[PDB]
């Protein structure tokens, strides 16, 4: 209401007090702001981590002490540079180098030559993602000076059953020879030797024309199969085609397992099939192709 001139003397000092107090609090706040800063420099912690141990392949790593399955860097002898791979290390010192993985249809496998050559998909530290490691790498890993390799295929239907198929002296050629697939023989497997062809019952040569040992890798943009048509193209995949296939792991992902000639764009069976274990109209739920030094596979 406009106090007396005698109020001024006191009222004026009341400001000086809260003003100075304010100042102090500001000095202490700037301090705290300084400490908060040392708290906000780190980046978010990434769950996916790559291990330190490296070798010529997963088995080398598994033999250097590696113990848990995960992402590692490997570098085969003749490899120009190292590359990230997925290693499966069981409790017996076995280290598998996985190069193909299907499990949900997340990744499209209708890729071109180069893509199948360099690889595609994603490597996850828990083997829960689909991918194609890459023909070139597969070649390097399976052709290291005097080291017989073995290939294991693991199937899993939409019921819960899981079967395997093994191949001794597995190998993939250089690009010069279209990464040709070859092996010494079927090493057994309750999944069946679908690499030896299948008597589909549509002709006398079905066996021969659907066998894979010796086949070169083929893609829509690079046909190297034994068929005037384009296997890789009509079946929308990248694979060691003949005319065309008994096994088709990089095939179209069909949810459920059962698909009809109508489901396909061009009648022919183009799913993830393996003739010696299921019908040509049954696509697998989980697919996995891994290799390891042969001598390592049960002596």
């Amino acid at each position: 209401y406009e106090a007396s001139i005698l109020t001024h003397d006191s009222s004026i000092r009341y400001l000086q007090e809260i003003y100075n107090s304010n100042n102090q609090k500001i000095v202490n706040l700037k301090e705290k702001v300084a400490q908060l800063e040392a708290q906000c420099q780190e980046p978010c912690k990434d769950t996916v981590q790559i291990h330190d141990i490296t070798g010529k392949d997963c088995q080398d790593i598994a033999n250097k002490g590696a113990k848990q399955s995960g992402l590692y860097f490997i570098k085969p002898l003749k490899a120009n540079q190292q590359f990230l791979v997925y290693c499966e290390i069981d409790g017996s010192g076995n280290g598998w180098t996985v190069f193909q993985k299907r499990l949900d249809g997340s990744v499209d496998f209708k890729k071109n030559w180069i893509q199948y050559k360099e690889g595609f998909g994603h490597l996850s530290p828990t083997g829960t993602t689909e991918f194609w490691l890459g023909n070139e790498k597969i070649h390097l890993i399976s052709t290291q000076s005097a080291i017989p390799y073995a290939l294991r295929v693991e199937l899993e239907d939409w019921n819960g059953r899981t079967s395997t198929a093994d191949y001794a002296m597995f190998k993939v050629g250089p690009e010069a020879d279209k990464y040709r697939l070859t092996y010494a023989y079927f090493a057994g497997g309750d999944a069946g030797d679908a690499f030896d062809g299948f008597d589909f019952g549509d002709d006398p040569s079905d066996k021969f024309f659907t066998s894979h040992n010796g086949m070169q890798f083929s893609t829509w943009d690079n046909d190297n199969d034994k068929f005037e048509g384009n296997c890789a193209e009509q079946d929308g995949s990248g694979w060691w085609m003949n005319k065309c296939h008994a096994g088709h792991l990089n095939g179209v992902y069909y949810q459920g397992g059962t698909y009809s000639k109508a489901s396909t764009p061009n009648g022919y069976d183009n799913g993830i099939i393996w003739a010696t274990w299921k019908t040509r109209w049954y696509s697998m739920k989980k697919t996995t192709m891994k290799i390891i030094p042969f001598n390592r596979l049960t002596i």
Binding site: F198, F200, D202, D203, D206, F209, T210, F227, G229, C231, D235, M241, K243, C244, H245, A246, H248, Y268, D269, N270, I273, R280
Partner: peptide, 4 residues
């Protein structure tokens, strides 16, 4: 995939 037996092509005719």
């Amino acid at each position: 995939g037996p092509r005719p």
